[PDB]
Design a protein around this ligand. Structure first.
Ligand SMILES: [K+]
Ligand SMILES: [K+]
Ligand SMILES: [K+]
Ligand SMILES: [K+]
Ligand SMILES: [K+]
Ligand SMILES: [K+]
Ligand SMILES: [Mg+2]
Ligand SMILES: [Mg+2]
Ligand SMILES: [Mg+2]
Ligand SMILES: [Mg+2]
Ligand SMILES: [Mg+2]
Ligand SMILES: [Mg+2]
Ligand SMILES: [Mg+2]
Ligand SMILES: [Mg+2]
Ligand SMILES: [Mg+2]
Ligand SMILES: [Mg+2]
Ligand SMILES: [Mg+2]
Ligand SMILES: [Mg+2]
Ligand SMILES: [Mg+2]
Ligand SMILES: [Mg+2]
Ligand SMILES: [Mg+2]
Lengths: 211, 115, 108, 51, 109
RNA sequence: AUAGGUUUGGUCCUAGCCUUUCUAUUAGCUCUUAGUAAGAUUACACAUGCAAGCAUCCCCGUUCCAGUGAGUUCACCCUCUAAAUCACCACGAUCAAAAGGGACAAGCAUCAAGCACGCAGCAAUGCAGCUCAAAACGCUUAGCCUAGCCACACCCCCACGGGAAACAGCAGUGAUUAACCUUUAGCAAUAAACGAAAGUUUAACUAAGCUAUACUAACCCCAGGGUUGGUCAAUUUCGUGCCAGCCACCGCGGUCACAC
């Protein structure tokens, strides 16, 4: 095979140039509030976000006004406050500000999540840090804000099989000599339907490429 | 052939002729063409009523279960078909569309009564 | 030949078919350069109406004009098909009547 | 909207349970094909016949 | 699962011994002629590792696939010498023979 | 091939060419209806309009589908093992890259030698070896083994870079060729992308338009084309006179020509 070395050189050069010309958060996640478009790409934001973009604050717009960038403070979100009655918040543990921003209002954060009053065991990266959806819990309100009594979370333990599948199961049992009259049942105790708005793993999320 | 990402899905491949559709239930890579390469044919579906006024659906239930257990996804029309067969629960959209049709026909009957 | 020799030589290898004056094409377009007449080889005697044409491929070739009476002149466009003129040696192309400038034979 | 959301949650729960059961059946069939008792008996019988 | 080499067990004649610890072996298979429907011999050359350099030109040897190729062309090892050239021992009777004649009679033992 | 015509003064043999059969493209002449299938000659150049969005901002997709056949043994089997789907707690299944082994188009040997193409050693280094008339090395031809697959995405194999400004997406156009479809509609179905979802988008697709290229069925009045010496079904009168002309092969035409 005749080697393709120019392809090797091109891939290596492009990798180096992408690693050295990384667009920063201050560039990627800036917004023109008059037209609600991203200057970096020119793509307009979805309609349903417009009002929030003009009313709410990004997470580090709050953190940059605090000592140590607000480590140990509690931060919640407007969407969580509207959607859920139980407390939802992040307890910050690590913050990496974007020094290139003029107001230090862009960057990354990590913390412990409590969703609907259930706290997690480990600290992980926070997603949607650049969203205009963030609010800071006052220190004199935290005791009232974090208060939560875990209600009995008793849901269905099992459900009926679909009609045809139930009939097939019963027919198989009867063919194999079993004469049991117990209904076939699907266990759903191991299926926990997590709410669609629960934070995902920001570590697995991608990043916009520089263009 | 190697596709970037992708997954197996059980779906309907359209065959037949103009004004006469027919569907082959096939498990295929989601990136493949609709009527192109497939992994296995898992059944068929004739959407036109026959001389007996019936829509004939053939389902290879054993292989359907096998491919679902192998990680294959399902297209929405297949979820509706399997719900109709009783293999799955009725899809929520069938129930919602039935309720919408009920409300629309109730509105029509109310119009008739008003007239 | 023995079976061993047949296995060694393998299946017969047929030479590729020879391309004719049309080079494997049904017809060819051409421009008439000059019109003239040629005499048959002699079991026969006549004055066969012929014309030299530059084909679309660039090659110059002699063609026969069938029918009684033709009005072909220089620089005119004609369509030529295959089929040898049995009487004329070296004339393997025939002008198509009723196409481009070459019109149909006048009645009677 | 609310009724549809609840219906989707329940339907997806049921479908996920069915999918896990199908996956378990597939894995069980693979295990019974490779290291199943009948397969092992057949292998031993074939070896004895060969000997 | 035990080897990445296609040919696992093969029998051939040693045709070369000029490489160090490597025997060049000729293996013949029967291939059907599609037209004549007769089986003809097809030859292939294999390089077999011979650590002790005990192979001689003309002897019939058995080659076993290596777990992985030890070289570009060496994918096999010498399992045994089926027939030593000019030193054949009759497998049926276990006695030395020269062609179709017994060098030592079976009855003698 | 159930074969047939044609070499000779004549017979037999050998041998070529052609005829009879079935397809596809184009050309001449002719052409009524309905349904269905199929549909630039050109890897030449392209005006114009569309062909990728979705979504509470992040991401995801635009790496797919669709197109072409320039190049061309990257496609298939086994081993190993990435990425992806589902288990997602992994045990592992499914799917499938890179790497290793095997297999794999046609013509030319007036392409007969290739010129480092091997092996052993932890390495240092040593041996001089390896392929090939059972076709190496080389030139030329071609997309293929079609539920589909391979290759390419203007060119320099590749694309950091350069030439330069790209329809081999749909519709359409110029040139070119014997070769010539509408600058329609809709996302109602299926498929794909996105979303938790109601849903949104899509020249994929669906439903239409044009065309005897093909198949099927008709038709109230409506038939054309070719042929008529033998092979091979079928000529009456005249005209012409080796001229005009005709033939797939054998051949006809010189005043009674079934051959113009
Ligand atoms: K004559
Ligand atoms: K998205
Ligand atoms: K090609
Ligand atoms: K190329
Ligand atoms: K649609
Ligand atoms: K006469
Ligand atoms: Mg003959
Ligand atoms: Mg004669
Ligand atoms: Mg025609
Ligand atoms: Mg993996
Ligand atoms: Mg591979
Ligand atoms: Mg020779
Ligand atoms: Mg020569
Ligand atoms: Mg080509
Ligand atoms: Mg182009
Ligand atoms: Mg290129
Ligand atoms: Mg086009
Ligand atoms: Mg055409
Ligand atoms: Mg449109
Ligand atoms: Mg159409
Ligand atoms: Mg006549």
């Amino acid at each position: 095979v005749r080697p393709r070395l120019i392809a090797e050189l091109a891939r290596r050069v492009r990798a180096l140039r992408e690693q050295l010309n990384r667009p920063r958060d201050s560039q990627l996640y800036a917004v023109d509030y008059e037209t609600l478009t991203r200057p970096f790409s020119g793509r307009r934001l979805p309609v349903r976000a417009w009002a929030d973009v003009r009313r709410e604050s990004r997470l580090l717009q709050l953190l940059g006004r605090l000592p140590l960038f607000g480590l140990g403070r509690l931060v919640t979100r407007k969407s969580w406050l509207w959607q859920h009655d139980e407390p939802c918040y992040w307890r910050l543990t690590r913050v990496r500000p974007d020094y290139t921003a003029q107001n230090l209002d862009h960057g990354k954060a990590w913390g412990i999540l409590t969703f609907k009053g259930k706290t997690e065991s480990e600290a992980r990266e926070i997603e949607h840090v650049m969203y205009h959806d963030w609010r800071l819990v006052p220190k004199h309100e935290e005791e009232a804000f974090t208060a939560f009594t875990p209600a009995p979370e008793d849901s269905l333990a099992s459900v009926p099989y679909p009609p045809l599948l139930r009939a097939m199961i019963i027919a198989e049992r009867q063919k194999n000599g079993d004469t049991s009259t117990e209904e076939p049942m699907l266990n759903v105790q191991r299926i926990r339907m997590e709410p669609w708005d629960y934070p995902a793993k920001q570590e697995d999320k991608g990043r916009a490429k520089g263009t | 052939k190697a596709y970037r990402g992708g997954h197996l899905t059980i779906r309907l491949a359209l065959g037949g002729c103009t004004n006469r559709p027919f569907y082959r239930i096939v498990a295929a890579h989601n990136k493949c063409p609709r009527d192109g390469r497939f992994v296995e044919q898992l059944g068929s579906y004739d959407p036109l009523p026959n001389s007996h006024g019936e829509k004939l659906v053939a389902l290879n239930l054993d292989r359907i279960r096998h491919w679902i257990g192998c990680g294959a996804h399902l297209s929405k029309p297949m979820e509706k078909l399997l719900g109709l067969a009783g293999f799955f629960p009725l899809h929520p959209m069938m129930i919602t569309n039935a309720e919408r049709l009920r409300r629309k026909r109730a509105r029509e009957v109310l119009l008739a009564s008003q007239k | 030949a023995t079976l061993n020799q047949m296995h060694r030589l393998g299946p017969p290898k047929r030479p590729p078919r020879k391309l004719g004056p049309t080079e494997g094409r049904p017809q060819l377009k051409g421009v008439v350069l000059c019109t003239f007449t040629r005499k048959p080889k002699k079991p026969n005697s006549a004055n066969r109406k012929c014309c030299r044409v530059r084909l679309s491929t660039g090659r110059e070739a002699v063609c026969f004009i069938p029918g009684e009476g033709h009005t072909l002149q220089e620089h005119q466009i004609v369509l030529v098909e295959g089929g040898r003129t049995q009487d004329l040696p070296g004339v393997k192309l025939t002008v198509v009547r009723g196409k481009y400038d070459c019109g149909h034979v006048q009645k009677k | 909207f609310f009724v549809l959301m609840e219906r989707y949650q329940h339907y997806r729960q049921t479908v996920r349970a069915l999918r896990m059961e199908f996956v378990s059946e597939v894995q069980r069939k693979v295990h019974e094909a490779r290291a199943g008792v009948l397969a092992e008996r057949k292998a031993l019988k074939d070896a004895a016949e060969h000997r | 699962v035990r080897s990445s080499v296609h040919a696992r067990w093969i029998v051939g004649k040693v045709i070369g011994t000029k490489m160090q610890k490597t025997a060049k072996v000729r293996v013949t298979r029967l291939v059907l002629d599609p037209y004549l429907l007769k089986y003809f011999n097809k030859r292939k050359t294999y390089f077999a590792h011979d650590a002790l350099q005990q192979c001689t030109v003309g002897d019939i040897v058995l080659l076993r696939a290596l777990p992985v190729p030890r070289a570009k062309h060496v994918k096999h090892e010498l399992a045994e010498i089926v027939f030593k050239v000019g030193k054949v021992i009759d497998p049926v009777t276990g006695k030395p023979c020269a062609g179709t004649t017994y060098l030592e009679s079976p009855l003698s033992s």
